[PDB]
Design a protein around this ligand. Sequence first.
Ligand SMILES: *[C@@H]1O[C@H](CO)[C@@H](O)[C@H](O)[C@H]1NC(C)=O
Lengths: 182, 13, 180
Amino acid sequence: DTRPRFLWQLKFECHFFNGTERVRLLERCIYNQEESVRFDSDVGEYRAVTELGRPDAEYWNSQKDLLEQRRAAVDTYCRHNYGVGESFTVQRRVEPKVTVYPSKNLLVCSVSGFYPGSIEVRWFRNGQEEKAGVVSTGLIQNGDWTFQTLVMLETVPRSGEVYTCQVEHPSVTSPLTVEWRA
Amino acid sequence: RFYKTLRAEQASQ
Amino acid sequence: EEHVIIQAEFYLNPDQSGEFMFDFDGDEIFHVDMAKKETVWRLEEFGRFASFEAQGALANIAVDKANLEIMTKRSNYTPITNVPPEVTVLTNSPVELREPNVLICFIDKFTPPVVNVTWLRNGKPVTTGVSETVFLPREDHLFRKFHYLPFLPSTEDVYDCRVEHWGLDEPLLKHWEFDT
Ligand SMILES: *[C@@H]1O[C@H](CO)[C@@H](O)[C@H](O)[C@H]1NC(C)=O
């Protein structure tokens, strides 16, 4: 299909810092791939980002009920919607499945199926932390409310050497430890 | 509890 | 920061395809099915602890369609430049023989939000057991999407993810097979 396409996106972004202490609303209108106009609660009015957005920022700012409604939305909408799903979003905890395996020479630590994305993975060689030669895939979001990470250790293991992968996550009270002997 | 929808606004004609 | 909740909607012409969805830290809470005019929760649990009135979502889409038609004229009919996707095939967990797993096709950094994704099991299209997500938003104003294929790790099977997008000249085929 070679026919031209015209796309319009509307986004309301509620950004929460220290629970619901500080909240910020961001209304963004995007024509094709260029954001044209926006309402930032920290500013208090519609602002044109591109020339295309100038009639809208001008039009929407002339409507007092809009500016009234949008200035209060951090409480009526953002703080409301955060409470609506707090127990299964903010309070969601899924314990990761930790697996250590060699993949040549590299020693892989697979941490999968966890929630939230906030994780710490530490490698150890005979009880001592090995910070150098550590390479991660980063945090992989699988799109089903679980994450995964792969934390590799560049090492040519000597016999008798015990490698340890230590994982720390909000889901567990104490760190998850997986051992691997050469 | 119900999720709230923020109403889209009609643009400059 | 700590958390971000996004109400993301789009309308696309001439396709006449709209979308309304909620995102919590990148992950879809729900979307509104435009045909069935009803709320589709990402995980069933969400439907048991929260509720939604989809007519508000469908009213927003009518406005998005109306505003797209205004912007189309205003921009002197400037169309979208196709941005082709970055395709990645990966598994949900480390692969073990005969242990059920899920193949993920991550289609990222693309626009407009229109793709054909097909899973191929030994060259033939597997149209059964598959699932997908809606077009998820990005900060660069492009889309991301995921396609899933629950499978049983085998030594005698090969998989391919076939992605077709208008920004690509030929289909993008991403391979996966069990190693060692
Ligand atoms: C999807 O498949 C149909 C098959 O006829 C094709 O014509 C169409 O262009 C495809 N869409 C995309 C986005 O590639």
